[PDB]
Amino acid sequence: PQLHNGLDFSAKVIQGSLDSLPQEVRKFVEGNAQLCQPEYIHICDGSEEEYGRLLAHMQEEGVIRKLKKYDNCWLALTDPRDVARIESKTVIITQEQRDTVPIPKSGQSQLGRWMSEEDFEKAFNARFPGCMKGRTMYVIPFSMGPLGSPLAKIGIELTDSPYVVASMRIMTRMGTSVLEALGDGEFIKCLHSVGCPLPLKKPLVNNWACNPELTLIAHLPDRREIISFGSGYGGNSLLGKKCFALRIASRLAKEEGWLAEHMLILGITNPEGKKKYLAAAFPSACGKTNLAMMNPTLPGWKVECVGDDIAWMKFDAQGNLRAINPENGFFGVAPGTSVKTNPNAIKTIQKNTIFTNVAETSDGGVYWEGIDEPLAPGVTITSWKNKEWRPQDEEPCAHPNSRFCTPASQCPIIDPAWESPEGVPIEGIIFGGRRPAGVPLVYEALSWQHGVFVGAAMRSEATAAAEHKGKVIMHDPFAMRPFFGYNFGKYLAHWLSMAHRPAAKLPKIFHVNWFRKDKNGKFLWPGFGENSRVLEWMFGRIEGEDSAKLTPIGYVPKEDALNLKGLGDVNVEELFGISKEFWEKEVEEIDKYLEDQVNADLPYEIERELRALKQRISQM
């Protein structure tokens, strides 16, 4: 069927067989092999042997280090210019801008970043032709969600990065069994390249191939394509992790009547043996991993982790909002993780874990800010920049965005249902932020519509990065600000429509704030495992207990409804205080923010909830 060789790349295949691929997977591979011109094609099978060989080969080539202190753990150090998501180079392509993002009244949108098809085609043509010369194109067949879950979705990621293959093995279900489940079905096309064809035009920094100048992370939801170039890091390269499971998935969910959210899922069991599942959307590094892996301090309470980052949710036939964790691993922020803050996370990462941009002890161990483990005299620290490091230095030993990548099955409190194909029934949805002033420990929404407004109005103190210096308070609606797959106003409309589904078992909605400070700057609430005392109250409110008092912002716990025994003197007046003056300012800021950033796409229900909140505050 060819006059020469076709687009038959069989001669370059060093693992697997092209003849064994479903026809459309094969066309995807060969079409992109022609474009990108890899030296080799490796069709991943997902086997332990493949994984071990891959790691051993990366070690030999100097791309990763084996950490000799642990069982099968590895360290990658990156080029300092490739250490995080780059928001300003992450884009969504649609025919109409407004389908992707509301048109902001001033400045740049904070809620999305559109690129025209025309501009994207020009960007694509300047990057991908020949970009894998000299390299292997890996074909990663992967399932987001348990294989054969009705909520699962399948992608194929092409990458030139073996780091990406190894990380994707942990973070997704991948290999031959996914191709067998796919058959001739639809899949999400995921194309990635580090953008460094051989021979190198510039020297490598830390043996880490990237192209910072040309980095571009693009999404084409209508084409079911994700196309990422020039970064090997995290959410730019592991295309399941944000591009697929939030950005593409949230647009599919809008089309198909489900939800793709930035939420942890936990199961909580009380002393009576009653269990509920909760979902929580917290702006990142607020303690998602912390809540989902909590060791509760209250006797007889248990928390089990279904997921710590992404939730796919859909109503079942009985009206329960069912959630699955579509991932297979945790890609957690390393700094701050310790035996005191998160002993379960520490147990998880003891083995079979890939670390990125943390410090290394002369031991062959790992280190970072906040690890809270002293080292023996003489044990030294190599920073993530491959330099000797002493605490005296201004710089951190580990990058602030450094990561562990670890199998979910190794979490010592992984929920028995964490892979159940039908998902777990969500009875509560928790929104949070870090707010040093004004916002009390916990409150409960007055209605579904109020609950959606609570999510839409979320703000949080975030550590200023390459966009800000110091802490900054930013709007992060539904903890989804960087992740919306489409116009945020339509996303709110989609949430609001859930109230209209007949016989829906709508979860209770709450907001929490672990980080309120008192008049001279100290934390009012100890947090960590003591947060179980707040989950207890939510649990009782889901059961309809008469434990709540009405306030202008929502229901709060009645006096003495919280178990505070053992906490010493809690300043309840300040912790649970509601200031008219603070809340007048909060509602005015939310009004300005929604008008500027959402304007004509804001649902009238949300504007009504703002109006109503304004009025309940006026009457204080």
Numbering used by the authors: 3 to 622
What do the authors of the reporting publication say about this deposited model?
Cytosolic phosphoenolpyruvate carboxykinase (PCK1) is a rate-limiting enzyme that catalyzes the reversible conversion of oxaloacetic acid (OAA) into phosphoenolpyruvate (PEP) providing metabolites for several metabolic pathways. We have recently reported that PCK1 activity and stability are subject to a strong posttranslational control by acetylation, phosphorylation, and ubiquitination in response to cell energy input. Thus, the ability of cytosolic phosphoenolpyruvate (PCK1) to perform its reverse reaction (from PEP to OAA) depends on its acetylation level on conserved residues close to the active site. By applying several biophysical and biochemical approaches, we have found that acetyl-CoA promotes the self-acetylation of PCK1, which occurs in the absence of a lysine acetyltransferase.
Analysis of the crystal structure of PCK1 revealed that chemically acetylated lysines were not localized in a specific region of the enzyme, but interestingly, we found acetylation of two lysines inside the active site, K244 and K290, with essential catalytic functions. In both cases, acetylation of either K244 or K290 resulted in an enzyme with residual activity (≤1% of controls) under saturated substrate conditions. To gain insight into the consequences of acetylation on K244 and the mechanism of chemical acetylation we crystalized the PCK1 K244AcK variant and PCK1 WT in the presence of acetyl-CoA. On the contrary, we were successful in obtaining the crystal structure of PCK1 K244AcK. These results indicate that acetylation on K244 affects the Mn2+ coordination and also the interaction and synchronization of two essential loops for PCK1 catalysis, leading to PCK1 inactivation. During catalysis, K244 is essential for the coordination of the manganese directly bound to OAA.
